[model samples]
Target: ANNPEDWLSLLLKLEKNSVPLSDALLNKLIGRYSQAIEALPPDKYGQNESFARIQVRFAELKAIQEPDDARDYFQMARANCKKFAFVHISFAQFELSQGNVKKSKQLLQKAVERGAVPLEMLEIALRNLNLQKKQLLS
Candidate 1:
């Protein structure tokens, strides 16, 4: 019965280890992690932690050529809406990877409007979008 914080801490620790992992292992870890969070009662106070871990997991997966699956996790996080900006930023990244610049921009704008994301995170997304735009123009 691992709590969200426990799972999050494990994930963070795993992240720091710099071990090479197979896609299957990564998928399994994320699946179990998500399930553990989902199994919690509705009134539980760990949704924020769950959401943050999902976002981090999605980003990690994205870096490893699993953008579509990452997008699914991001979508799930978006449904939670406890941290709307993070979810929107994840969605924007998915859109960016899929070459949907307009949609990505729109999602980023919505994320900014939510006003819940750290300034640095927002700036990173904006900078990525700008790079994508430049790539498209070139």
Candidate 2:
């Protein structure tokens, strides 16, 4: 019999293992994780829910096949945290994959504005965006 905390612990362990995760499994884990996190007292843990949300969204996007729909979901996740560099970066990747260069650039700009993104990550995003543009123009 698994309690809420047990479910959360399992979810965290799943995240750490980094094994191939299916969409169904990811959604289930996200649901349990959210419930557990909500049950915690204030100040018990900081940002674990946010981090789990990011991971869940990333997994969801990875499992999506349709570019436009995936981009929309990615945008939804990005909206949850303006200063979350990983979310921005992942959203930019989704846009680029969908051939939405303008949206990708905008996301990258937002990431820069947040000031939480490391310079190296920003540089990589810029380089990839430029490369993608060149390829598209060719």
Candidate 3:
């Protein structure tokens, strides 16, 4: 997939066909799509939510590769969590992974507040809330 539409179509096909995509393929897509994204005019892709979602998703994956960098990237993505559900959910998970469940829950709530997350995501936020008071004791 060289262009935005091409990549989007591929993702749709995978979803529609229920084709399981491995993490390896996801990392591969991140690499290739990032390059393709760079080849496009900056705003042509950057300003486009369809493309912005990919960028946010790649950063999300990167957090798994380097857990320590989660907050750093999360700091930026949270600035516009309303723009990408991946940013909200992924960053929340990263925060939880980092043992900051309160922050995780907060970010997810922020996402819900902005109308950017799925129903299950709100459940995730709520579930994480149980850790909030407990975290303070630690």
**Which regions in candidate 1 have their CA more than 4 angstroms from the true location?**
14-18, 41-47, 55-70, 82-84, 133-138
- Estimate every model's Cα lDDT from 0 to 1: 0.61, 0.58, 0.60
> Candidate 2 on 19-104: residue-level lDDT in tens?
57776776665565555545644243223444435444543544363454555556655554545566677777666766678988
User: lDDT: which candidate is best?
Assistant: 1
Clashes of 2: 0
Please write out the lDDT profile of model 1 over residues 39-64, one tens digit for every residue.
Answer: 64434542465646555564556546
Candidates by lDDT, descending order: 1, 3, 2
Looking at candidate 1, the ten consecutive residues that score lowest on lDDT are 129-138
Model 3 shows how many backbone clashes? 0
lDDT against true structure, model 3:
0.60
How close is every model to the real structure, measured as TM-score? Answer: 0.67, 0.58, 0.57
Model 3: per-residue Cα lDDT over 91-122, one tens digit each: 76667767887677787777777777455656
Tell me each candidate's RMSD, in Å, in order.
4.5, 6.1, 6.2
TM-score-better candidate, 1 vs 2: 1
Candidate 2's displacement at residue 125, Å, is 1.0
